[PDB]
């Protein structure tokens, strides 16, 4: 019998989703992942699955699926790919060249853009090196541009390593809030729980 549905319905529908420097890592397991329902969800704009096909995905068991959600601009969705550089690809979220999941994403310029000043998100414009594949840097220390100690100051040597977006409703596509959720798949030496409807 088809019971114990996945909590994916609670993931793809919310008000405040996440930021790119602090992205969720929901470990979903022990359910019949019906990816056919994930197709006829809200009108997504990207369902590029790199590893396998969604038709054959419903016939393969898995151990646990890592759902990672964030919000980026329109011209940045291209950077969420198995191997690519960018201000968001190597500083906030990087995917290895083995991603067996999907890059599901959709425009959300209906509830993530109000005309009051949207100083809510950030994208970590400053960094010291490229982030490890699937790494999250939840830090707020003032970025030090070398050659001088900084016990916390903002001028001419040390700046805020984060910068907020400027999402506004009266803009064009490309500068609009786009919610991107990736589903990393894995199979360790553990019994597979999530298989799919049979």
């Amino acid at each position, epitope marked *: 019998n088809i019971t114990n549905l996945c909590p994916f319905d609670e993931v793809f529908n919310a008000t405040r989703f996440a930021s790119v420097y602090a992205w969720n890592r929901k470990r979903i397991s022990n359910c019949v992942a019906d990816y056919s329902v994930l197709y006829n969800l809200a009108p997504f704009f990207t369902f590029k699955c790199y590893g396998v096909s969604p038709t054959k995905l419903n016939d393969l068991c898995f151990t646990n699926v890592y759902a990672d959600s964030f919000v980026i*601009r329109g*011209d*940045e969705v*291209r*950077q969420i790919a198995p191997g690519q*550089t*960018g*201000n968001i690809a*190597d500083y906030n979220y990087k995917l290895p060249d083995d991603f067996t999941g999907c890059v599901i994403a959709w425009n959300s310029n209906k509830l993530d853009s109000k005309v009051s000043g949207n100083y809510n998100y950030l994208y970590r*414009l*400053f*960094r*010291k*090196s*490229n982030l490890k594949p699937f790494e999250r840097d939840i830090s707020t220390e003032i970025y*030090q*541009a*070398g*050659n001088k100690p900084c016990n916390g100051v903002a*001028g*001419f*040597n040390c*700046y805020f390593p984060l*910068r907020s977006y*400027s999402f506004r409703p*009266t*803009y*064009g596509v*490309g*500068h609009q809030p786009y919610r991107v959720v990736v589903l990393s798949f894995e199979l360790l030496h553990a019994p597979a729980t999530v298989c799919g409807p049979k």
Partner: single-chain antibody
Amino acid sequence: VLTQPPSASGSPGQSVTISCTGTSSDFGGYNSVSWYQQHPGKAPKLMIYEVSKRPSGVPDRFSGSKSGNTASLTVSGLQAEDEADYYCSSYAGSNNFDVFGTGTKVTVLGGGGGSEVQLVESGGGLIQPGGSLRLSCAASGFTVSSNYMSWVRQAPGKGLEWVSVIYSGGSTYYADSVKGRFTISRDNSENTLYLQMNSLRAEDTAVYYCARGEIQPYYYYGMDVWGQGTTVTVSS
């Protein structure tokens, strides 16, 4: 490619108010419109980065509001003795170079950075055509391995244009003019950051400028310092 008036001399300092009309949008997404006072000779100087937001300098040139689809930089009441060419670059496109504008002659009259961090170059006097010449901009101030560096070249007559951008540690984005024949390589992690010619195609005769910060996605960085460039003078 942007649209700027070739010159502006009528009614000096009263109704000049030059503006870079045409951005196909509400003047970019990041809302950052650059204005560099590219005086002939020395390197350009930062004047306006945000809408107006005039930094520590001359205060008689402000009010660069985005009137409709253009940013009308109010330059009236500034002065009546200047011979320079102003520039404007405003965009937010991912990996889109050539963001600078055409040469705007804002000469009101026409007729009538050194100790900050550092300024050094290679001095490419009589460059052999092609080859591989390295140009360094050793900075004894801020770390040349932590901040974002850039390279912008300008040729006799033609305006400025983005040529090279390098991020903190893991990006080597090149421009569309070189399309790959230019190989950016950061120098010693505690000394400097140099460039590489790699068999130019006779178009790299323009003079270079190693900028300490990004231009289109601009950040204040405390102070905007440039370096005096060198004439390549190819011999093809």
